[PDB]
């Protein structure tokens, strides 16, 4: 089964899922960095403008709904949501599964007023599921329909499909060459060992080794504040409140950035990490690489998001606990 994704500004990739009977439609980001499912709730006070601007799940309109009500809070790197647990049928790419999810009643305007999507579908492991709720992919596997215990991600460029998720396999139509796998450092987290990060002609980063969270929910490639300081200083980039910019005219002159994973060099060109909105030296162009300190036990860690995925088709193998990369097509 495949899920078609919409690409919004190269920063938000989302697909649609159906919840309840009759189905209530929601736009959601599929995030390998988290393990819970949540959508805005009809029970969210309208004083939360984000809720006024998003699809709200209404339990009183679903004959398949099953009450639970256990309170829960989901804390992401850029924001927090809170609400309670509910159970209902969810349709994903044609597949129907009974799932426990969060009905969010507290959704901060910043950052949610800026979210094109309504909610999130955690594709992570149960180990990191808040409230220990069984993850949707685990619930799908338990059905015994998928030919393989794996899911794949394809994120296209902004274009004028925005992307695609394949449940139970991969789509040869979106990658070339063959996959190269890196075993997970530990089950329960889609994090792999990274052997080094080179900027141009000087592998001055992640010397001695470091961690890499393969995060489909992260818009950018991220690293600790220290690491990014060195990387950016090397690029001649100036820091701002929530990102780094470079004068547009020099964007194309920026050096390649390579990530050493599993004995393979995954290389990105400046065209791959710079939002080349123009070539004026009188304008600032943002870079799709940010500083992000991810707390323990997962972090400190680098995070490989959309910026990386766009270039490399990614397969998440639950059966062999590893991740495979291939040149996106």
Swiss-Prot record:
Peptidase A1 domain: residues covered: 13-326
Catalytic activity: Cleavage of Leu-|-Xaa bond in angiotensinogen to generate angiotensin I
UniProt GO molecular function: aspartic-type endopeptidase activity; insulin-like growth factor receptor binding; peptidase activity; signaling receptor binding
Disulfide pairings: 44-51, 206-210, 248-285
Record's subcellular location: Secreted; Membrane
Glycosylation site positions: 68
Principal location: secreted
EC code: 3.4.23.15
Example of a GO biological process term: angiotensin maturation
An annotated GO cellular component: plasma membrane
The protein's assembly and partners: Interacts with ATP6AP2.
Function text: Renin is a highly specific endopeptidase, whose only known function is to generate angiotensin I from angiotensinogen in the plasma, initiating a cascade of reactions that produce an elevation of blood pressure and increased sodium retention by the kidney.
Annotated family: Belongs to the peptidase A1 family.
Descriptive protein name: Renin
Lineage: Eukaryota, Metazoa, Chordata, Craniata, Vertebrata
Residues included from the entire protein: 74 to 406 of 406
């Amino acid at each position: 089964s495949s899920v078609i994704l919409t690409n919004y500004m190269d920063t938000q990739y989302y697909g649609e899922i159906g919840i309840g009977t009759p189905p209530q439609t929601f736009k959601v980001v599929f995030d390998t960095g988290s393990s819970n499912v949540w959508v805005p709730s009809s029970k969210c006070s309208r004083l939360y403008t984000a809720c006024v601007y998003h699809k709200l799940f209404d339990a009183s309109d679903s004959s398949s709904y099953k009450h639970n009500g256990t309170e829960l809070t989901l804390r992401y790197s850029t924001g927090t949501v809170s609400g309670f647990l509910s159970q209902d049928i969810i349709t994903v790419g044609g597949i129907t599964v009974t799932q426990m999810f969060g009905e969010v009643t507290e959704m901060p305007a910043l950052p949610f007023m800026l979210a094109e999507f309504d909610g999130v579908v955690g594709m992570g492991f149960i180990e990191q599921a808040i409230g220990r709720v069984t993850p949707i992919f685990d619930n799908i596997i338990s059905q015994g329909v998928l030919k393989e215990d794996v899911f794949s991600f394809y994120y296209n460029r902004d274009s004028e499909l925005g992307g695609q998720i394949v449940l139970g396999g991969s789509d040869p139509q979106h990658y070339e060459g063959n996959f190269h796998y890196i075993n997970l450092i530990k089950t329960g987290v889609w994090q792999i060992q990274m052997k080094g990060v080179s900027v141009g002609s000087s592998t001055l980063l992640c010397e001695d080794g470091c961690l890499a969270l393969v995060d489909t929910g992260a818009s950018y490639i991220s690293g600790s504040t220290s690491s990014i300081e060195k990387l950016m200083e090397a690029l001649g980039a100036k820091k701002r409140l929530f990102d780094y910019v470079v004068k547009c005219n020099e964007g194309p002159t920026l050096p390649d950035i390579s990530f050493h994973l599993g004995g393979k060099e995954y290389t990105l060109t400046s065209a791959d990490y710079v939002f080349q909105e123009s070539y004026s030296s009188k304008k600032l162009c943002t870079l799709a690489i940010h500083a992000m300190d991810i707390p323990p036990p997962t972090g400190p860690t680098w995070a490989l998001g959309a910026t990386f995925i766009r270039k490399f088709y990614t397969e998440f193998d639950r059966r062999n606990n590893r991740i495979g990369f291939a040149l996106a097509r």
